[PDB]
Design a protein around this nucleic acid. Structure first.
Ligand SMILES: [Mg+2]
Ligand SMILES: [Mg+2]
Ligand SMILES: [Zn+2]
Ligand SMILES: [Zn+2]
Ligand SMILES: [Zn+2]
Ligand SMILES: [Zn+2]
Lengths: 162, 162
DNA sequence: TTGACTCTCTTAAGAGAGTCA
DNA sequence: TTGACTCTCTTAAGAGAGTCA
């Protein structure tokens, strides 16, 4: 098995490579009518992506390193968390984009949590709008708001009560 | 079926059958430390379910009627909305449980909205905790809260900024 | 050892359609 | 005509693994 030192070396090479990705400045809603700025380190749209990186789906990538003649591969956003527990409350841990920008690989924009916690950040009011996430959101979720409901609760007769 | 009259008759038969499902009282968080009471009309756990109803998955059912000698079939929660647009902003409209209770078929607990709007209600703080849904939630979402994040944003080196 | 492709799978909110009796 | 089963599919947040040079 890879030693602690070897895992740290993988994380360091990953950080070195991602740090050279194009850095894009994005202005974002924080909640409470306030605006903030996030700096995303974005993997390229097409090959080559960077040393160790390859695309396995339209917005999915993997990181690969060969150590002592054995090929090791990880989801491209999971590398910052290789020294962390990989499950919690019986649920698999997932890399969760605080910036809601899939191509971004900035580890300061990622956390490690259940898929339900991950998804739920899409609707969070944001760090200045009432976020209660213990690991705080960096911005208001892109899907926060009144929604676009086509039809609400209704009955034609009198068979039901709420 | 095709005619508005035929559709109204489908909705009326569905309401009459679901109106005879057992009524189960559920006490629910509203947000703001308050609690409310919902009355869910719950489809049975096993056959028979009711005239026109059949189970196609562990928590999936369909409603079926024969009109003009042809079988017409719908997802069991979609029937209240048969006269509504079936898409919005290019997204499919879905039956969305305001009570977060799949077996419930009370149309006063259903709305008709995109899958994103539907999903997002799982994390809503609720009608007494800050819900901003234009079609208001009936309860705080079951997944609202601080979450259980295992690891937050972090870097080993000095290549990244937020 | 490395790059650039290929494939299918998970989850939990939701769907459509066929086989028998 | 009605009932009780069977199967696979959609979405958008996420995954693992194979092939070839
Ligand atoms: Mg996410
Ligand atoms: Mg729902
Ligand atoms: Zn980012
Ligand atoms: Zn939040
Ligand atoms: Zn209900
Ligand atoms: Zn709400």
């Amino acid at each position: 098995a890879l030693t602690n030192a070897q895992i740290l070396a993988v994380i360091d090479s990953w950080e070195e490579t991602v740090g050279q990705f194009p850095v894009i400045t994005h202005h974002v809603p924080l909640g409470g009518g306030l605006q903030g700025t996030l700096h995303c380190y974005e993997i390229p749209l097409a090959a080559p992506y960077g040393v160790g990186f390859a695309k396995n789906g339209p917005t999915r990538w993997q990181y690969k390193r060969t150590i002592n003649q054995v090929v090791h591969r990880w989801g491209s956003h999971t590398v910052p968390f290789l020294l962390e527990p990989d499950n919690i409350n019986g649920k698999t841990c997932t890399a969760s984009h605080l910036c809601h920008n899939t191509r971004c690989h900035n580890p300061l924009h990622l956390c490690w949590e259940s898929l339900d916690d991950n998804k739920g950040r899409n609707w969070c009011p944001g760090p200045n709008g009432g976020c209660v996430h213990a690991v705080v959101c960096l911005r208001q979720g892109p899907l926060y708001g009144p929604g676009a409901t086509v039809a609400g609760p209704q009955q034609r007769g009198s068979h039901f009560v709420v």
